[PDB]
Nucleic acid binder design. Structure first.
Ligand SMILES: [Cl-]
Ligand code: NA
Length: 307
DNA sequence: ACGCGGCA
DNA sequence: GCCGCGTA
């Protein structure tokens, strides 16, 4: 339980503003401190203990000691007027901060403005068409139906395939922003070929409505369950050889903050961690537990990675 | 890391 | 062919 909601509320505001403004790493820094605040065992009540928490130095320790002494944050009044429109535009999938600054400085202010005068990549037109659906999280039971759809379409090509939905679904959340389905085969062999066929099969059945990125082993697209009343949902499908299954599981389960900290830890031990492998030369990792072992870390259930 | 898409 | 952008 967050004992410091008194301030994290105020700070996610600034964090989000820097984010849509394209100050990636300022926002990163703030996000990292917020997470420390959420998890610190008690409410913080002094400047000595501010800087105590890793992730808070001078500039951050202040705003905590300002909100505590003042009940407010001065910089929140000095937040650019454009920020809400920047957030609107970068909530379009395929449009980032640089694209949203452009459309802003071209004079656009509304989504109708974008549908009218703005030039859009294919992905951004899909993103804008599904704007509202894509900001809506799905119950995890809908995610299950999406996983099962992919799993059954795949298992008809080969029954031995492992298919696992990752993300916050795997971390136990009651709602999910999107679905990532990870596929492998234990025989180390049969994962080859079926990616093309499976996407067709799913396209042929009307399950896939829109393609966003067609990679060789990784697909990003849009799906919708059968029948009426349903929303388009972001779906990724990833096919991996069996020896990469553990690192793939760990990466696509996340969370993203958890992935960043693990990569950092791996770096401080002469290693690097990707969705593919734990490396120096690839260190074999048959299960997620082994990745944890090598980094000198206690295993952590998916629900415990929900950083 | 890597698809996407501009490059008049 | 290159390289910025966006997302993962
Ligand atoms: Cl989005
Ligand atoms: Na976006």
């Amino acid at each position: 339980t967050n004992h410091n909601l008194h301030i994290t509320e105020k700070l996610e505001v600034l964090a989000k503003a820097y984010s849509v403004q394209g100050d990636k790493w300022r926002a990163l820094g703030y996000a990292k401190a917020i997470n420390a605040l959420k998890s610190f065992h008690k409410p913080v009540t002094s400047y000595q203990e501010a800087c105590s928490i890793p992730g808070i130095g001078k500039r951050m320790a202040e705003k905590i000691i300002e909100i505590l002494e003042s009940g407010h944050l001065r910089k929140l009044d000095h937040i650019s007027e454009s920020v809400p429109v920047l957030e609107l535009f970068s909530n379009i999938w395929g449009a980032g901060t640089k694209t949203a600054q452009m459309w802003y400085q071209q004079g656009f202010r509304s989504l109708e403005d974008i549908r009218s005068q703005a030039s859009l990549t294919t992905q951004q037109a899909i993103g804008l068409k599904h704007y509202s659906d894509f900001l809506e999280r799905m119950p995890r039971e809908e995610a299950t139906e999406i996983e099962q759809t992919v799993q059954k379409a795949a298992q008809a090509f080969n029954s031995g395939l492992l298919c696992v939905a990752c993300g916050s679904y795997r971390r136990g959340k009651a709602t999910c922003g999107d679905v990532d389905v990870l596929i492998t085969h234990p025989d180390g062999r049969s994962h080859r070929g079926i990616f093309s066929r499976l996407l067709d099969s799913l396209r042929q059945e009307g399950f896939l409505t829109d393609d966003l990125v067609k990679g060789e082993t990784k697909y990003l697209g849009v799906c919708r369950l059968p029948g009426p009343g349903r929303r388009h949902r972001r779906l990724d499908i990833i096919v991996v050889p069996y020896s990469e299954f553990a690192c793939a599981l760990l990466y696509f389960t996340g969370s993203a903050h958890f992935n960043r900290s693990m990569r950092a830890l791996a770096k401080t031990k002469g290693m690097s961690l990707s969705e593919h492998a734990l490396s120096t030369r690839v260190l074999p990792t048959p299960t997620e537990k082994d990745v944890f072992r090598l980094l000198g870390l206690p295993y952590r259930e998916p629900a415990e990675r929900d950083w």
